[PDB]
């Protein structure tokens, strides 16, 4: 089970997934309410088995298991909202399924994980995962979670650039350390963060993912060190 | 670091637990290939010696003086006493084993030690397989404090016991051993260590040793700990336990290895740019004495490229001070002679020892310049003058420790030596 | 740098429309080892395709389509030219050399017709990289859909036709025969199989080696012994190299012989085909599209007195080994396709499921 | 793409000049069929006699002073992306070379050798798939066959007296294996 209810209410847009092809249409199951089954010339080919497709609800049920789904009269500009209802809630379902490790305990966990926020501020499947992203950055509202303690606080590539800069002289290595820590000092003021080293022979220094194309910053700071201080003591360079 | 003392032992008697018994610290490294009967590295220990009206030879442990070279029979002596152990001389034992495979090890750490002790084996045959081989490379480097460290008569049978050592001392005409008297030891029973281990230090004085000359260092270690997935700030140089031969090495002392990698348009040898190296960190075998006495070993820490010190491909590089007295030419001459046997295996045929294959044309050469075995192809080399042809422009000081290797099999041989002009 | 051919041994003038191809000649002696005029990976794939080492029809067409996918992958479109037309008139000499090397099935033929209809469907205003990755994704989902859900669609359709206690004979190695019978046997019916094989190919050794591993009892014989086992069979399926427009099967040498001796004892026969194995054109018999092989593969180990040792120095003895033969309509009863079960002389109704006409 | 090759300098050529030194015909019947953008690794004095070679392509690559054999490939590593042919200098050529490269294409393999016109080398009945070569002194141990490699492959034919030519029709997998396992050397071994 994922959502609080068993069936969505009047005019709710539905992410849905077909299992098999019926005679009236296709037997289309529905994972987002724990696998409930409904309906919708070489149409009968089985190109659609197990793939999520956007749809909207049609009529009004109470309990009787009405699952029909009109692919035609849905609008695709609202289908991205249905995809946001799918993928964010799917990340929620995955991580919250890995929360438990050994049924209705999991369901009562689910109503006391996201439906607390969605009964305090009422956002169905959008502010839940984003409020969890808030909560892993700020668990202040998770202090209201008066659960047992151990369940509360539980809630790529980087450009590995490498230019080996070293000298044989003691004054040479002194200027190497001086201009390397000066390049760290210059990297502090302009603030490209996270330039460290895990290999003493080379400069295994990480052009990280903060702009994802920020090799220009580490590159021109590096080349300023290359042109500035060290390399009048035989700075000879390979890749 | 005043005097070094070198045990020198040839094939097949055991040099691991006897190094443990009388010297204390045993040699170990990584991917070591440490021994099969005797070792193949320099067996070095860290020693501070003291004598307190006691003939015994203690270690810097100041409570007892014994060993563990036998399981059953323990004769022992008056060991000494406690009380913040003193220091007679800055002495430390070293070893130089006797296979023919350790030419790097046996030729780099032998001219740099100070006293020598030649050992006679006790687990070999009735002929002498390698007795005239493994100080004949030490013949040209000209050590002085040399002694017959008589070792094994324990499991030795009586028919080959009491006279054949004189035949070994007569069979070593290629080894400077006639001025080497006998202070005996025991590799198993280690009997009566207070006289047995006494005059291997007490009789031996300082060698002829220069105090304040140029440090013209041939280095024996250049090692480093920078495995894949390493730390951040391991900026060091040659992390070495470094035996020095000449020159005081204080803090701020200057020392240069001039070629290293040969300079631009690599057919010359020198450009006037000295190699500036300030050795501050110096480990005096248990302490950080920055003021290194000549002759003895000290734990040397330099400051160069750390990439260049992982795998020591620099066995015997000349690091000399200012005042560049070494030579500048690439046409290497020697005043050589030949090995008379071709020995290393025992037999009664006199057939592989027939002749001495000289230099040729369109034929290879290799010879450990110090401990550096380079070569190349030759053009026209005469009969009795040794003109070594090479490929490395190196301002080495004097290659007075060379061994002319020559292929006959998977292993090379020993055919020559030589003294530089 | 011109693609060349030859004849070898002798080629019977009764089949003057039909070529000969030798395989023990040299196929790179004309062509210097690097080339950009014909793409090298597709050339070495055609060389695979003429060392005999690929013979299964859906296997060889998927191999050729993986190859032409790799050709359209790495060749970027250069500027100052027309986008699609340059690529398609480089693709035509490609398949010319390919059907030159070893000749054409139906699968290659309507496959390259599909890629031509695709490359003329590509919008020229779409820029290069996304168009290339788009056509890449388009044709590999095409072969993905067609081949693998054709396999499991004929599985889910021909599973409900197989009896229990029945036996079944088959001839030729396709993939989908092994797919239907093994994927049925993983669902637990009750049967036993028998694999007849022929000459010079010794073809169904593939299938026999498969079905001894899949866990089904088998039997093995050759077409002189055909009617000896023919009373026992209760139903027979049959893989096919090439479907036709008049309800026919253009496939391996002795297909129609077992079709005829299967009608001759009244055992009904079904065959398994798909969409992309029928041509647009159609024939009366095989003698206008059937190639030949190496003659000198025929042999017996009857001492060193091999009767076909010095063949070609005699001129009054010809070796004429048809490889790819046709089957009449009203003796094969039905085909099995991705739409289900349709009778044999009703097969051209799939010709206009194109635009639902 | 196929468009590169290389020839190692030393085996395992300064003084020997027959009519020319060791480079008469290998560049001929390497370049009489294609191969006009090649990368040759060299080593000095022999690197500057390249006008009377009159080849329609020469690209020399020098190295360091005293080097081995896999390091050559490891230093030409940063620019090679496709099918590679590495030769040696212990060669006459008396064969149409298209057949070795076409069989190497014909299995889509990664390795090849030349063993035609002390010495033991095995290959199966078709004459195509091998195990290993045996020499005169490294095989002081006698001869060892693995279990499964003889359990599947029925026979093997040890050859007696032809010569090696140290050709390697080859591709990117084993050179990535060489650059990552750098300390593994001895291309002949």
mmCIF file of N, CA and C in Angstrom, chain D residues 63-134:
data_model
loop_
_atom_site.group_PDB
_atom_site.id
_atom_site.type_symbol
_atom_site.label_atom_id
_atom_site.label_comp_id
_atom_site.label_asym_id
_atom_site.label_seq_id
_atom_site.Cartn_x
_atom_site.Cartn_y
_atom_site.Cartn_z
ATOM 1 N N UNK D 63 61.448 7.541 -27.542
ATOM 2 C CA UNK D 63 61.151 7.015 -26.212
ATOM 3 C C UNK D 63 62.248 7.458 -25.242
ATOM 4 N N UNK D 64 62.341 6.778 -24.101
ATOM 5 C CA UNK D 64 63.435 7.038 -23.179
ATOM 6 C C UNK D 64 64.617 6.121 -23.488
ATOM 7 N N UNK D 65 65.609 6.128 -22.590
ATOM 8 C CA UNK D 65 66.921 5.578 -22.922
ATOM 9 C C UNK D 65 66.945 4.056 -22.911
ATOM 10 N N UNK D 66 66.718 3.434 -21.759
ATOM 11 C CA UNK D 66 66.849 1.991 -21.620
ATOM 12 C C UNK D 66 65.517 1.406 -21.177
ATOM 13 N N UNK D 67 64.702 1.005 -22.146
ATOM 14 C CA UNK D 67 63.317 0.635 -21.883
ATOM 15 C C UNK D 67 63.102 -0.825 -22.259
ATOM 16 N N UNK D 68 61.944 -1.356 -21.874
ATOM 17 C CA UNK D 68 61.594 -2.737 -22.137
ATOM 18 C C UNK D 68 60.700 -2.905 -23.346
ATOM 19 N N UNK D 69 59.576 -3.602 -23.176
ATOM 20 C CA UNK D 69 58.710 -3.906 -24.314
ATOM 21 C C UNK D 69 57.247 -3.481 -24.173
ATOM 22 N N UNK D 70 56.582 -3.674 -23.031
ATOM 23 C CA UNK D 70 55.194 -3.250 -22.891
ATOM 24 C C UNK D 70 55.071 -1.758 -22.636
ATOM 25 N N UNK D 71 56.146 -1.141 -22.154
ATOM 26 C CA UNK D 71 56.175 0.295 -21.934
ATOM 27 C C UNK D 71 56.061 1.086 -23.226
ATOM 28 N N UNK D 72 56.490 0.513 -24.351
ATOM 29 C CA UNK D 72 56.288 1.132 -25.657
ATOM 30 C C UNK D 72 54.807 1.374 -25.925
ATOM 31 N N UNK D 73 54.000 0.323 -25.762
ATOM 32 C CA UNK D 73 52.556 0.432 -25.909
ATOM 33 C C UNK D 73 51.954 1.340 -24.850
ATOM 34 N N UNK D 74 52.465 1.262 -23.621
ATOM 35 C CA UNK D 74 51.941 2.094 -22.548
ATOM 36 C C UNK D 74 52.227 3.581 -22.746
ATOM 37 N N UNK D 75 53.287 3.943 -23.470
ATOM 38 C CA UNK D 75 53.512 5.357 -23.755
ATOM 39 C C UNK D 75 52.876 5.821 -25.059
ATOM 40 N N UNK D 76 52.618 4.925 -26.022
ATOM 41 C CA UNK D 76 51.811 5.357 -27.168
ATOM 42 C C UNK D 76 50.315 5.260 -26.894
ATOM 43 N N UNK D 77 49.914 4.747 -25.724
ATOM 44 C CA UNK D 77 48.528 4.667 -25.249
ATOM 45 C C UNK D 77 47.583 5.867 -25.430
ATOM 46 N N UNK D 78 47.946 7.132 -25.141
ATOM 47 C CA UNK D 78 46.907 8.183 -25.132
ATOM 48 C C UNK D 78 46.306 8.525 -26.492
ATOM 49 N N UNK D 79 46.906 8.101 -27.606
ATOM 50 C CA UNK D 79 46.275 8.280 -28.917
ATOM 51 C C UNK D 79 46.327 6.964 -29.694
ATOM 52 N N UNK D 80 45.364 6.080 -29.416
ATOM 53 C CA UNK D 80 45.016 4.939 -30.260
ATOM 54 C C UNK D 80 43.657 4.433 -29.788
ATOM 55 N N UNK D 81 42.740 4.241 -30.738
ATOM 56 C CA UNK D 81 41.337 4.085 -30.369
ATOM 57 C C UNK D 81 40.652 2.902 -31.041
ATOM 58 N N UNK D 82 41.371 2.147 -31.861
ATOM 59 C CA UNK D 82 40.704 1.197 -32.744
ATOM 60 C C UNK D 82 41.611 -0.009 -32.971
ATOM 61 N N UNK D 83 41.321 -0.763 -34.038
ATOM 62 C CA UNK D 83 42.061 -1.957 -34.436
ATOM 63 C C UNK D 83 43.540 -1.663 -34.625
ATOM 64 N N UNK D 84 44.379 -2.518 -34.051
ATOM 65 C CA UNK D 84 45.812 -2.274 -33.963
ATOM 66 C C UNK D 84 46.568 -3.497 -34.460
ATOM 67 N N UNK D 85 47.656 -3.244 -35.182
ATOM 68 C CA UNK D 85 48.552 -4.282 -35.669
ATOM 69 C C UNK D 85 49.949 -3.928 -35.170
ATOM 70 N N UNK D 86 50.505 -4.790 -34.324
ATOM 71 C CA UNK D 86 51.868 -4.563 -33.864
ATOM 72 C C UNK D 86 52.795 -5.638 -34.420
ATOM 73 N N UNK D 87 53.888 -5.195 -35.032
ATOM 74 C CA UNK D 87 54.889 -6.038 -35.655
ATOM 75 C C UNK D 87 56.173 -6.042 -34.840
ATOM 76 N N UNK D 88 57.195 -6.687 -35.387
ATOM 77 C CA UNK D 88 58.534 -6.649 -34.829
ATOM 78 C C UNK D 88 59.512 -6.514 -35.985
ATOM 79 N N UNK D 89 60.785 -6.775 -35.702
ATOM 80 C CA UNK D 89 61.802 -6.584 -36.728
ATOM 81 C C UNK D 89 62.442 -7.906 -37.141
ATOM 82 N N UNK D 90 62.042 -9.005 -36.499
ATOM 83 C CA UNK D 90 62.561 -10.337 -36.816
ATOM 84 C C UNK D 90 61.694 -10.947 -37.913
ATOM 85 N N UNK D 91 61.776 -10.370 -39.112
ATOM 86 C CA UNK D 91 60.868 -10.775 -40.178
ATOM 87 C C UNK D 91 61.532 -10.659 -41.541
ATOM 88 N N UNK D 92 61.482 -11.755 -42.294
ATOM 89 C CA UNK D 92 61.255 -11.675 -43.728
ATOM 90 C C UNK D 92 59.750 -11.670 -43.966
ATOM 91 N N UNK D 93 59.335 -11.365 -45.191
ATOM 92 C CA UNK D 93 57.927 -11.488 -45.566
ATOM 93 C C UNK D 93 57.873 -12.226 -46.898
ATOM 94 N N UNK D 94 57.133 -13.334 -46.930
ATOM 95 C CA UNK D 94 57.007 -14.145 -48.134
ATOM 96 C C UNK D 94 55.593 -14.686 -48.298
ATOM 97 N N UNK D 95 54.595 -13.923 -47.857
ATOM 98 C CA UNK D 95 53.225 -14.409 -47.786
ATOM 99 C C UNK D 95 52.282 -13.231 -47.991
ATOM 100 N N UNK D 96 51.181 -13.488 -48.696
ATOM 101 C CA UNK D 96 50.105 -12.515 -48.781
ATOM 102 C C UNK D 96 49.484 -12.325 -47.406
ATOM 103 N N UNK D 97 49.738 -11.165 -46.810
ATOM 104 C CA UNK D 97 49.417 -10.903 -45.416
ATOM 105 C C UNK D 97 47.931 -10.693 -45.156
ATOM 106 N N UNK D 98 47.093 -10.686 -46.199
ATOM 107 C CA UNK D 98 45.667 -10.442 -46.006
ATOM 108 C C UNK D 98 44.987 -11.599 -45.291
ATOM 109 N N UNK D 99 45.591 -12.783 -45.324
ATOM 110 C CA UNK D 99 44.910 -13.941 -44.776
ATOM 111 C C UNK D 99 44.947 -13.973 -43.256
ATOM 112 N N UNK D 100 46.036 -13.536 -42.618
ATOM 113 C CA UNK D 100 46.065 -13.535 -41.155
ATOM 114 C C UNK D 100 45.090 -12.502 -40.602
ATOM 115 N N UNK D 101 45.054 -11.320 -41.210
ATOM 116 C CA UNK D 101 44.129 -10.311 -40.722
ATOM 117 C C UNK D 101 42.685 -10.671 -41.084
ATOM 118 N N UNK D 102 42.461 -11.440 -42.162
ATOM 119 C CA UNK D 102 41.069 -11.766 -42.449
ATOM 120 C C UNK D 102 40.562 -12.905 -41.572
ATOM 121 N N UNK D 103 41.424 -13.842 -41.157
ATOM 122 C CA UNK D 103 40.963 -14.821 -40.173
ATOM 123 C C UNK D 103 40.780 -14.188 -38.797
ATOM 124 N N UNK D 104 41.638 -13.216 -38.455
ATOM 125 C CA UNK D 104 41.461 -12.461 -37.218
ATOM 126 C C UNK D 104 40.161 -11.670 -37.216
ATOM 127 N N UNK D 105 39.753 -11.160 -38.375
ATOM 128 C CA UNK D 105 38.393 -10.659 -38.513
ATOM 129 C C UNK D 105 37.371 -11.788 -38.445
ATOM 130 N N UNK D 106 37.741 -12.987 -38.901
ATOM 131 C CA UNK D 106 36.751 -14.022 -39.172
ATOM 132 C C UNK D 106 36.277 -14.706 -37.901
ATOM 133 N N UNK D 107 37.030 -14.599 -36.813
ATOM 134 C CA UNK D 107 36.430 -15.055 -35.558
ATOM 135 C C UNK D 107 36.009 -13.933 -34.623
ATOM 136 N N UNK D 108 36.246 -12.668 -34.997
ATOM 137 C CA UNK D 108 36.080 -11.500 -34.119
ATOM 138 C C UNK D 108 36.864 -11.680 -32.817
ATOM 139 N N UNK D 109 38.103 -12.141 -32.944
ATOM 140 C CA UNK D 109 38.924 -12.536 -31.809
ATOM 141 C C UNK D 109 39.683 -11.323 -31.272
ATOM 142 N N UNK D 110 40.684 -11.559 -30.423
ATOM 143 C CA UNK D 110 41.529 -10.495 -29.904
ATOM 144 C C UNK D 110 43.015 -10.775 -30.062
ATOM 145 N N UNK D 111 43.393 -11.973 -30.501
ATOM 146 C CA UNK D 111 44.786 -12.387 -30.556
ATOM 147 C C UNK D 111 45.078 -13.009 -31.913
ATOM 148 N N UNK D 112 46.371 -13.088 -32.238
ATOM 149 C CA UNK D 112 46.869 -13.840 -33.383
ATOM 150 C C UNK D 112 48.366 -14.045 -33.231
ATOM 151 N N UNK D 113 48.907 -14.948 -34.048
ATOM 152 C CA UNK D 113 50.341 -15.192 -34.130
ATOM 153 C C UNK D 113 50.701 -15.530 -35.567
ATOM 154 N N UNK D 114 52.003 -15.573 -35.837
ATOM 155 C CA UNK D 114 52.544 -16.142 -37.065
ATOM 156 C C UNK D 114 53.576 -17.200 -36.725
ATOM 157 N N UNK D 115 53.279 -18.447 -37.071
ATOM 158 C CA UNK D 115 54.229 -19.536 -36.883
ATOM 159 C C UNK D 115 54.294 -20.321 -38.189
ATOM 160 N N UNK D 116 55.106 -19.830 -39.122
ATOM 161 C CA UNK D 116 55.415 -20.521 -40.367
ATOM 162 C C UNK D 116 56.825 -20.150 -40.793
ATOM 163 N N UNK D 117 57.121 -20.415 -42.058
ATOM 164 C CA UNK D 117 58.421 -20.093 -42.621
ATOM 165 C C UNK D 117 58.417 -18.663 -43.158
ATOM 166 N N UNK D 118 63.236 -27.581 -28.155
ATOM 167 C CA UNK D 118 63.478 -26.227 -28.638
ATOM 168 C C UNK D 118 62.211 -25.458 -28.978
ATOM 169 N N UNK D 119 61.420 -26.009 -29.893
ATOM 170 C CA UNK D 119 60.307 -25.287 -30.512
ATOM 171 C C UNK D 119 59.082 -26.198 -30.501
ATOM 172 N N UNK D 120 58.077 -25.823 -29.717
ATOM 173 C CA UNK D 120 56.807 -26.537 -29.682
ATOM 174 C C UNK D 120 55.678 -25.523 -29.548
ATOM 175 N N UNK D 121 54.604 -25.742 -30.301
ATOM 176 C CA UNK D 121 53.453 -24.849 -30.360
ATOM 177 C C UNK D 121 52.243 -25.641 -30.842
ATOM 178 N N UNK D 122 51.113 -25.464 -30.157
ATOM 179 C CA UNK D 122 49.940 -26.269 -30.436
ATOM 180 C C UNK D 122 48.716 -25.524 -30.928
ATOM 181 N N UNK D 123 47.924 -26.209 -31.751
ATOM 182 C CA UNK D 123 46.733 -25.663 -32.385
ATOM 183 C C UNK D 123 45.859 -26.856 -32.771
ATOM 184 N N UNK D 124 44.555 -26.618 -32.921
ATOM 185 C CA UNK D 124 43.589 -27.699 -33.100
ATOM 186 C C UNK D 124 43.538 -28.184 -34.547
ATOM 187 N N UNK D 125 42.501 -28.968 -34.847
ATOM 188 C CA UNK D 125 42.417 -29.679 -36.118
ATOM 189 C C UNK D 125 42.142 -28.735 -37.276
ATOM 190 N N UNK D 126 41.372 -27.674 -37.035
ATOM 191 C CA UNK D 126 41.097 -26.711 -38.094
ATOM 192 C C UNK D 126 42.333 -25.854 -38.375
ATOM 193 N N UNK D 127 43.290 -25.837 -37.448
ATOM 194 C CA UNK D 127 44.518 -25.095 -37.639
ATOM 195 C C UNK D 127 44.432 -23.669 -37.177
ATOM 196 N N UNK D 128 43.514 -23.372 -36.265
ATOM 197 C CA UNK D 128 43.152 -21.996 -35.982
ATOM 198 C C UNK D 128 43.212 -21.644 -34.502
ATOM 199 N N UNK D 129 42.824 -22.543 -33.601
ATOM 200 C CA UNK D 129 42.698 -22.173 -32.193
ATOM 201 C C UNK D 129 43.783 -22.864 -31.363
ATOM 202 N N UNK D 130 44.501 -22.094 -30.540
ATOM 203 C CA UNK D 130 45.768 -22.507 -29.941
ATOM 204 C C UNK D 130 45.642 -22.800 -28.445
ATOM 205 N N UNK D 131 46.755 -23.237 -27.837
ATOM 206 C CA UNK D 131 46.897 -23.149 -26.384
ATOM 207 C C UNK D 131 48.069 -22.266 -25.958
ATOM 208 N N UNK D 132 49.306 -22.570 -26.373
ATOM 209 C CA UNK D 132 50.538 -22.029 -25.786
ATOM 210 C C UNK D 132 51.737 -22.588 -26.560
ATOM 211 N N UNK D 133 52.878 -21.900 -26.463
ATOM 212 C CA UNK D 133 54.131 -22.266 -27.115
ATOM 213 C C UNK D 133 55.102 -22.820 -26.079
ATOM 214 N N UNK D 134 55.984 -23.728 -26.505
ATOM 215 C CA UNK D 134 56.990 -24.271 -25.601
ATOM 216 C C UNK D 134 58.387 -24.050 -26.171
#
